[PDB]
Structure formats: C-alpha cells, structure tokens
Amino acid sequence: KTRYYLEQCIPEMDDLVEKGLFTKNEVSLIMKKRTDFEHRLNSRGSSINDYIKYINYESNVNKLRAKRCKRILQVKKTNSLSDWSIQQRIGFIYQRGTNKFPQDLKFWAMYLNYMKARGNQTSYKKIHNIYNQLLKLHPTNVDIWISCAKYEYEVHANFKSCRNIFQNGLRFNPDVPKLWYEYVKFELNFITKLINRRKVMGLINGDIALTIFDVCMKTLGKHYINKHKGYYAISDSKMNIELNKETLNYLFSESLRYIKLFDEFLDLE
C-alpha cells in the first residue's frame, strides 16, 4: 500500500506549485525521494534508522518551504494545505515507527521532544496519550515516570497529576531507590514553593517526605532481601544474619543520600 501513503502527498504537492514556491521539476525531485523512502519503510528489513532519515528529510523540506515563503511570497503563512501538511506527515511517520519499533527507546524520545517543541500545534492532551502508551509498554523503566512527572510539574505545574505519576511508578517499581529519591525530591520542591508562596503572601499583605523516607526504607529492604536469596530462603542461620548486614548497610547508604538531599533545602528545618 505504498501508493496509498503516496497519494496523500499529492494535494500538498499540488498546493506547492499552485502557490509558486516550488517548480514542477523541483517537486518531482521531492516526490521521487519520498517515493524511495516509502518503499523502504513498507519493506522487510526496515529499521528505526529508516524512519529517522525520512523524518529528517521532511523537516528540511519544511524549512525550505517556510524560508521560501518569505523570499518569494513574502508572507509569514500562506493559508493553504501546505503550511500544516508537513507537520502532520512527520507525526504520522513517527507513529508508524513507534508502532513498528516500540522497543527502541530512543525513537520515542524524538516524538516527545518533537511533539513538545511545537506546543501550539500539538495540544498537551496528545502529549499525554503518548506518555500513556509509553509508560504502558515499559512500566518497569523508572525513567519514563520521572519524565512525564517532570513534564507536567514544569510545563503545566499540575502537582496533583505529577504526584499520581510517582504513586503509579512506585507501584510498579518499589525497589528502585532512584525513583523514591526522585519522589521525595519533588515533594520537598512542592513544599518549598508552597512556603515561599506563603512568604510572598505575607510580604504583599516536610513531614510528608519523612513518611516517604520511612516507607521507602521498609520496601527496599524487603526487595533487597528477596534478591541475594533467589527462589528459596537461606537455611543457614549465619548466612541469614549476613543478609541482614547488607540490607542494613544498603539501607544505611540509602538513608545517607537523603541526609545529603535535606542539606539543600534551607527553608525546611
């Protein structure tokens, strides 16, 4: 069905010549290369690199069109299919690549970055669904959970949503000390902003983390006990005593990082 994708380009390419930005011969060069790319994607042996090179191609085509618009048309945006057509396609190619290669973590990031960069074109809701899909293919990679938690605490400043991320992320990945460290880091940021707002409120006129500290310590030990024991319990008493030693030291080191973390927050006691 390579043609079916190809025919979608014709109304766009017709718009280019009609506006006069691109000559007949020039567009033929564009369509030819597009034709070459589509066959590669639709064929066996296609790789994620194949989607990347195609995606890079349109971006340069997009730059040529807009840059040409100022030189020839002398208009910021010509009201026609051409202006938003390329941007629709690039997202479409990406979606195919993500579906075609969900495993490649790298290729997703381009979509989140690409989708995020053109915020005006692309509503945050579209960004949400991609994260919903991406978390949900890879629940065990903590680095998503912080990433989407990150995005909606800075771009949107919706702490209620960001907190739910850590709650869900911790539900899947309770043994990752980093995400706990990341979750307490967010909470203390929320408290510091809140009290600073309170200070500003006066001028113009936290315990929660410690609970995270405590509950974190219990589960990490529980999982660290699970590992180093394998399928079965340890019959030897002395070895069982040892397994208590590593967790204490592992938990002690895991505590010590927070002791460093608290040091940053001057506002807090």
Partner: protein, 162 residues
C-alpha cells in the same frame, strides 16, 4: 464481546487487546482454525498492548504459585489497574476460570471470559510467543520456563540442599 486478553510469561505478564473478534458460530470451521496458526492473520486479531517483566527469580516463583492457587499478586493487580478502563463492563479474556472470581473481587468492573473463544486466542498467543512481542525485551521463554521449572517443583516437594 472480548476486548482485552491477559497472558502470563515466565519473564512477566502480557496483556493483549482484541482488535477484531473472530466468528464464534464458525469457530470450528477449518478456515478460522488455520488463521490461528497463521501469524499474519493472528496479528490482525490482537496486538500486544502491555508487558511488565518480573523483577527477579523470586518474584516469578511467587507469582507462579499465586497463579497456581488461583490468586492475584500485587504485580498482577498493578498491571490490570493501569490497562483496564473503568467503564458497560470491560471484558477480559483469561485462561483460568479460577482466577475469574479473584479478578472480579479486586476489580468489580471487569468481566472475565474463559470460553473456547478465549482459549482459542490464548493458544494463538502462546503459539507465536516472542514473535508477538514485536521486539520488546522478553528474554528467552524456553530457558525461563526451564528457570522456573524445577524452581516451582522443588518448592512444593520442599527439596533442600541438605
């Protein structure tokens, strides 16, 4: 009336979404049965929607038991919670009827299926195995099955190095 399919792997738990519903009246027709063997046809029926690998060897055995006595683990609860919409009632296809009541208790809004239609798809999922995971990291099932095998067995017999 099925939309989501629950499957379990030695590496983890896999959920599938049923894009197309096979004919139920003609379930026994050779032509529908040949499709289950055919990977190309099968991919049109379902699509892998989630996979959450087990954290380590210990977790797999614990879940391997919990599946055996028809119980829901914390890992299973988390996955189903994230995937199944609240919704009249979303339908989930499951191999075990005994896991049915357990799933219903934790999630009142899900209705489980274990009819031959569900079994037919579950067979297809297990037929193609890692090919349906579309490149996702599921290790090697055959070795992981070997990994859990005596591990599940020796546990019940209470085998020990002593």
């Amino acid at each position: 009336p099925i939309e989501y399919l629950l499957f379990e792997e030695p590496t983890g738990y896999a959920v599938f979404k049923v894009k197309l519903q096979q004919d139920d009246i003609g379930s026994r027709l050779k032509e529908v049965q040949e499709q289950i063997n055919d990977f190309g046809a099968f991919t049109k029926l379902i699509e892998l929607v989630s996979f959450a690998p087990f954290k380590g060897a210990a977790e797999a055995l614990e879940n391997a038991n919990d599946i055996s006595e028809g119980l829901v683990s914390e890992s299973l609860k988390a996955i189903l919670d994230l995937n199944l919409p609240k919704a009249k009632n979303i339908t989930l296809a499951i191999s075990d009827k005994n896991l049915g009541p357990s799933i219903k208790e934790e999630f009142p809004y899900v209705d489980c299926i274990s009819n031959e239609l569900a079994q037919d798809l579950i067979r297809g999922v297990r037929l193609h195995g890692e090919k349906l995971f579309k490149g996702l990291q599921s290790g090697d099932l055959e070795r992981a099955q070997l990994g859990l095998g005596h591990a599940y067995s020796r546990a019940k017999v209470k085998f020990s190095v002593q």
